[model samples]
Target: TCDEKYANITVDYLYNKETKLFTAKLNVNENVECGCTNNEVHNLTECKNASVSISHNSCTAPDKTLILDVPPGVEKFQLHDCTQVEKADTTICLKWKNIETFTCDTQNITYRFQCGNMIFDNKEIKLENLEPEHEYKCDSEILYNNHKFTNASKIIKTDFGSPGEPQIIFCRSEAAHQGVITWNPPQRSFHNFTLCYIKETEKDCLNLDKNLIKYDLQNLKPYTKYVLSLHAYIIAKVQRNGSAAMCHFTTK
Candidate 1:
């Protein structure tokens, strides 16, 4: 129960019950007869069952929650900090120790750093710079069979707002709901800014497109919250001094 030794298992997968089973990609790398603390297997691209695996509604996940899974008798686990985000994809990153910022809600928060060989020492992961309105999907685990980890999950939305953080929003829509996101909202001209609008129906992301500013995303989750923001790098007259405004909306 509470103190029972957990077998090889930890953070599971994140699933969106209503729609797609899983939101992010779940990859497992099993290294047999490998490093003492190892998850060193190469990229195993098996994200076909993302939703069904992580759609558990019981556990509670915080802004940047860290749920641990360790095999019994394998008490040696480490908690590293989130190191760097892929330039192309910001969602995934290498977790490291002595991370930028660290916080933890529970004890025994440990993990293996994705860096090369050296795994971090055992320590409760420290959470850092977590914003409210932010949601995180947790990967669940089954503490029996060969040790395995699910995959990348979505962190929920944050209700707070930062004035001018460097961020990019990509909006998309289906063929029928084909609305274009017009980029280049003029600064004072309101032409070169990124605009995010939505229709009512689905909770699936990705309908949000990128590049263009004005979007015509229909069939969104009715009364779902829409996040909108803009950047001004396209022109001089439209973008005064190169900057963007974090504008957003929630459609009914």
Candidate 2:
């Protein structure tokens, strides 16, 4: 019986610069005669698969928009994206516009594109000096084979300004053990208010309506120091707590 041996083989390697992928075609020579030595040399390099995906869909932002609660005096915040692109050599574009003032007759508020050694893969893009409480629509685009593809637009809202400090009017004992406290609400808009009073180990809290600014403290101890704290809340798509306003007085 004669043994089958493979002598020589030729491989045609095809590489795509756009996708950064490789394909190999092999041509093998099969012979029935046995050969003492079969020398084959193949130099192969690493290749990666091309993939692209986005985090949000069309209904993602409309159902539940992204709300950012930035601190005071901070003019910059990072907007995150879950876009993944395998190759950095392809063209990727990012566009955003303020929905409130955007007009169809003009271009977007901001536009940026990257290609050839630059990519945005699950990264945070910084937006500076953006208006507070403004809604922005952001989307991504890609150019492949003279065709343009766009991802679903995302909505992002900046920080809704917090309520100012509540002003205390007066804290006095009206009758014997009863104490009455009055305060003016913050000048800004708020959903509701919270009033809390602490006397040593005893604590009392009241959630008052936004229209009411006065709270009466009933059943208080005589000749004891009572601490009064008031704060406001803004309830929209999200809740925000304003700075606390405080006052202290002793009951006789």
Candidate 3:
């Protein structure tokens, strides 16, 4: 009886000696249908449960579409490009590229672009350049499911490329419970920066700017290790080259 496939189904059994009843739980694995390399109908998104919602701990993300408007004056911005894994039926490589820099607008013109068959437009209404060297302006709207989420834009000097990654000067803990981090900012400015760190609680990420690059993390364990990863960027424009620099250091 142990040689049968059903034998593996019942992982553990509880035998009630008095009642003569046996209780067990079975862990079942199902064989599901998948694609057959046919582009026309056999698509990954067509797979069963592929479009189901996933819960990330306490974070509940609503099913909504995100559209990033191309900053006026930039030639083009790639919305989404994806390639399915050769053998992995459930994996994919996706890439999106947004505008990083554009020439200063000497004479602004009403330009246009397409996002799933929608057009976005704007004007030359003079606005102070967020960064001194670059003149920046846009629709100032970030959409989610046809609704405004936040205004995302960027600014980069016409003569220079995008900003380099900020340098992490040091991350050290002076006391058993307190850790200090310091960094030198990049030459080119950014719209916002994100810092992520973990000690003994939920992973936390915060939107920050150049002035707050240096952080004094509190309530860390004594003689413990922590990694602080930072990414400085121009929102809706460019992401840092890769994953942010991981500043590894030990608490006192």
Candidate 4:
């Protein structure tokens, strides 16, 4: 006899006429249950085909397109991404409650973006007011039956804007036959500064350090008029140069 769900039982009995005694033995084999025994299932234990797509939005405002896709069994999803907003100078998190709606703590985020009203299987969400020419890393996860399935992370950068112009502070001779010029750095980010000064037919240019705002000119002829210009450059996927800041001065 056996309880099939839990255990199997076996019995053995022997009888002898001379001893007039019987001996019996019993054996029980317990069954071990299959699958997660302790109710400690992981969040990503049974998930498949979780993915999302992202692209830069070339509109009047800085925006991006996020399309979420999950497997058949998934009904809802959430998104977690971060970026430095323009002029905010801080990193902000974007969390999506459903695929079509999201929220952020940053002040620059535009909450009234467009969302497609299609089936829940695929979601198209437009994220607006992102910083231009900045890199944004976005991550998405499918939420099904209290389990989370992570999708591949997507990184995209916005289109570049022209670098701001550098302002010249002072362009005057500090010593005899020597001139010193100083300028404020550009407001936006830049790779380096190009300082060019011309004296009649002779022209000279130098690539100054990005952090430096001043340059010293040497071996200048006495009482010679010179024209100096400063330009800021941004060397990224594309090279961009800002408008030059010009200055005029004459050596002693």
Candidate 5:
């Protein structure tokens, strides 16, 4: 008589004829188990166990979606495609890969952004801030099963002032990409210089170029008012000793 069923025939097989001894043989139909697909990434083990149309070079899991590298300018994104690709950012996705960084396209033709994808049995925590101008950073806080994520202020810079209705001009981040400054037509002319930038909670009441009918201030924070008048530096160029306005702004 011929056998109908076989267990572990490929690696280790249990023979029905034997009391306890078993035999082993390599699986012949492994090709049907492992196949190939377009843009798919897989290994030999995954291909063999997979039941669906398998791929030799590329393949997707039976349950999850295919996932790939996150493109540029895309952040706080996730994907699912039966594919089993893990995230790789040590800063975040310590275990799995999470594509949450700002990436841009190589070709100038496309400016669209793309975030990566993910899958999990339980809840997942992700930090993605989309507000422009102001800076943002990833932050994670967990309480029990509950997770709280936010962008820390370290990536942002804020400034407030009593400009009341001062006309803003020349708004630009410093060359260092750290400092910021702004001003309008000075209240006075080339007389006693009085420009100020706040270093603390104190109010910046001085105005360099205070006498100018039109302000030529450059470098200002967008959508932010210097609360301390000007955490940034302010300079006056009226004195014989040429001076430039400068200040610092730190996000709290």
Candidate 6:
């Protein structure tokens, strides 16, 4: 005969007709046995969920809702999905499955963030005296039946100030049919310097040396009135464009 039930299939037949043992392998669909949709498998195997994503160690649910924040210098974060059922009106029942291991560390140095296999309740820890400029990195581990379901990390960098406008320190006429423009680099980020003539909409990109804060504007119609504008740029991770500094000069 053949027997089929919830996630179970069995077929029995006489093998040598003398206490024969027959075994068949079984494959269970993820949704069949208490499995949720969109299982990404977190840091722990038992912490199964529909979804868990991380960026910069900011752990959140499938809805992208913030569940935990692992601050800088702190390594580990734990997450779990638990269920509670009511056996009776006043009597309640709760069961929770946890992960196997939860730990954190550094690029070189190692640190410990103690977390158990199961978390019946969630707690938030305080971040102490964190530097405003330090880029914080944190990682999260989600557990599933004493194993990893999902693991993610995130890096966070804060901007303390805005980029200051570029200042035209001085300008001079050059002999080789050129005009020299000198400027103080923006206070925050000095990625590049741009020069634009008010007479035309086209702007010129001055490939400024990242090591220095000066640029020599070259080659222009002599004895011409030029309304030039300058701005400094700071881009990457954080981006800022300094306010425009207008310079009016008559090239000789």
Q: Of the candidates shown, which would achieve the greatest TM-score relative to the real structure?
A: 2
> Each prediction's Cα lDDT score?
0.31, 0.48, 0.43, 0.51, 0.28, 0.39
Q: List the residue pairs that clash in candidate 2.
A: none
Task: Kindly list the per-residue Cα lDDT of model 4 for residues 1-252, writing each as its tens digit.
Answer: 112222322322232334433222222233212211221111221123222111112212212221122112122234534433332222334444444422322222222212222112222233555556667654444323222322334455664545768988999997778998988888888888988989878888989888998899998888989999889987744676778998999988
Best by lDDT: 4
Task: Assess the local accuracy of residue 236 in candidate 1 as a C-alpha lDDT between 0 and 100.
Answer: 23
The digit string of per-residue lDDT tens for model 1 on 1-252 reads 211212223433333434323222223244212211242222222222111112112222221122222222211122322423211111223332332322222243333322222333322222335443345442222121233332222233322222232344443333442433344334232223334342334223332222344556555554445554444433221222235444344444
Q: Against the true structure, what is each candidate's TM-score?
A: 0.18, 0.47, 0.34, 0.40, 0.16, 0.35
lDDT of 2: 0.48
Compose the digit string of candidate 2's lDDT tens values, residues 56-163: 222121121111111111011122342222211121223333224211222211233332234443223444444445665655432212222123445655555567
C-alpha-based local distance difference test score of model 1: 0.31
lDDT of 5 by residue, 1-252 (tens): 001121222221223222322222223343323222232232322102222222232333442221222222212333212211121111122112234543323232121111233322222333233221233332222111121211111122111111222334533434332334455533222233444544346444554444443323334344333332321222221112213344434431
- Using TM-score as the yardstick, the better of models 2 and 6 is 2
How would you encode candidate 3's per-residue C-alpha lDDT over 67-119 as one tens digit per residue? 12212222223332242222112222222344444332314223332322334
Best-to-worst ranking by TM-score? 2, 4, 6, 3, 1, 5
Better of 2 and 5 by TM-score: 2
lDDT of 6 at 152: 44
The residue-level lDDT of candidate 1 at 38 comes to 40
Q: Please identify model 1 stretches exceeding 4 Å from their true place.
A: 1-72, 79-133, 140-252
